[PDB]
């Protein structure tokens, strides 16, 4: 499942897809759910297989990508993109020394996500 994380897209929707951007499957499904209800330009998709090493570097957390491997390259590509890591994964939270978003921490972490809705 983690191998089949990403998917390439054909055509545009109401977002910035156009020809052959590689975006994660969950996020394009989210778009497709709101698109199907509202309409807008429909987007053909195709799931891509990533073998482990590249799949881990293709994660949209650059703190996880850096900690894994290829740190110099990961930080230049993130620095140039002005990438913003909102700290969703486990490795990210372990690095900043915080509660893991899992096990005991899942209760507390879901309470923080709802604190984002108000206050």
């Amino acid at each position: 499942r983690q191998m089949l994380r990403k998917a390439t897209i054909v055509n545009a929707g109401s977002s910035d897809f156009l020809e052959g951007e590689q975006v994660e499957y969950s996020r394009v499904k989210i778009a497709n759910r709101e698109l199907e209800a509202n309409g807008k330009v429909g987007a053909t998709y195709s799931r891509d297989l990533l073998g482990i090493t590249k799949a881990s570097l293709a994660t949209e957390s650059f703190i996880s990508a850096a900690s894994f491997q290829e740190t110099t390259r990961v930080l230049t590509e993130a620095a140039v993109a002005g990438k913003r890591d909102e700290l969703r994964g486990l490795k990210e939270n372990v690095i900043v020394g915080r509660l893991i978003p899992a096990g005991t921490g899942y209760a507390y972490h879901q309470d923080r996500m709802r604190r984002r809705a108000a206050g």
Binding site: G103, T104, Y106, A107
Partner: protein
């Protein structure tokens, strides 16, 4: 319990929530000095909370209800 905590998992369900609820209750006895419902029997605050959960006296919902009650009594006193 003493040996194993399976019975207390069977009361609440989620091992993770068992730990939060036992933690919250043990903190009350640790700090507030809240009196234990079961005889202490030289048991640490960690085990007493698990006994209370096993027998079904302590629970997230019950703890919340009594927090509101003590908190409203204090509101009454301040006003």
């Amino acid at each position: 319990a003493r040996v194993t905590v399976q019975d207390a998992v069977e009361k609440i369900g989620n091992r993770f929530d068992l730990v939060l609820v036992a933690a919250r209750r043990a903190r009350q006895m640790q700090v507030g000095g809240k009196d234990p419902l079961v005889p202490e029997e030289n048991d640490k605050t960690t085990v007493i909370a698990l006994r209370e959960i096993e027998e079904g006296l302590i629970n997230n919902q019950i703890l919340d209800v009594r927090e509101r009650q003590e908190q409203q009594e204090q509101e009454a006193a301040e006003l």
